[PDB]
Ligand SMILES: Nc1ncnc2c1ncn2[C@@H]1O[C@H](COP(=O)(O)OP(=O)(O)OP(=O)(O)O)[C@@H](O)[C@H]1O
């Protein structure tokens with residue numbers, strides 16, 4: 679079925695973020711609850727038909743680790759992307775309530791991100807471009823899925839920043855970047871969720887005892903490109919997890935681990951084996967089921 683503006687009805691607002699707001703909506707003709715992302719674009723009518731045409735590949739983006747797609751259209755000054763409602767929300771939301779995310783839980787998350795990036799790369803030849811906690815969504819059936827990845831090339835162009843960057847050193851320094859940049863983003867996201875806060879600048883020894891002003895924009899970006907990469911703090915995390923994120927955060931992107939290597943890493947093999955009620959932990963910490 680084709681999706682269209684007057685067939686919808688706002689239930690609530692799921693949140694906002696720099697460009698679009700997303701609503702929990704009811705598609706009246708189907709009865710389905712969806713998440714409708716609206717993106718305001720003051721843009722000519724020729725190229726907003728190309729954006730919709732290129733978003734149609736999301737119908738073939740079927741994966742347990744990728745947020746489902748219902749359809750896309752253009753309304754009155756905004757392009758709508760309609761997707762699976764994830765009732766657990768994004769991992770930046772669950773991090774606020776949880777304080778930290780346990781290491782065993784981040785094992786299941788890491789697996790999901792690797793397998794989702796791998797799906798997008800192998801089957802659709804695209805990189806995410808925007809891996810961070812807010813773009814990793816979870817639900818009460820225990821599924822972990824990626825969204826807001828760069829399918830339509832034209833859509834990226836029409837939106838071309840924020841106080842916290844998950845961009846790799848190489849991407850910050852110029853156009854010389856590709857799929858390896860997503861690895862860096864994931865690594866930083868994992869350190870953040872593990873520790874309970876954005877890991878740049880790194881916490882001093884006294885701030886690490888308490889756990890276990892904000893930087894200016896240039897000061898922060900200068901740290902990412904010129905200062906050594908964030909480490910997972912020793913002792914409280916396993917040696918295999920520390921190595922995992924260290925391989926993800928190697929400044930040199932060719933020296934840095936790629937998806938193939940991370941898939942067979944000791945941390946992933948171990949987390950594959952582990953028995954985790956992720957559904958039960960997720961609902962327990964945010965109050966749902
Ligand atoms: N499919 C969805 N189901 C449930 N909640 C969603 C869904 N998509 C987005 N959200 C929620 O809406 C919020 C806003 O999302 P949006 O993509 O517009 O910005 P963001 O990713 O949070 O931040 P930024 O724009 O800087 O990347 C997210 O934090 C998330 O909690």
Ligand SMILES: O=C(NOCCO)c1ccc2[nH]ncc2c1Nc1ccc(I)cc1F
Pocket residue numbers: 695696697698699715717736744745746747759761824825826827828829830831833834
């Ligand atoms: O929403 C995007 N960014 O988040 C900022 C909004 O404030 C975004 C950006 C660039 C993009 N190119 N192709 C798509 C696309 C995209 N959305 C998107 C992609 C996959 C799914 I499943 C659902 C989506 F909504």
Ligand SMILES: [Mg+2]
Pocket residue numbers: 695812813826
């Ligand atoms: Mg987003």
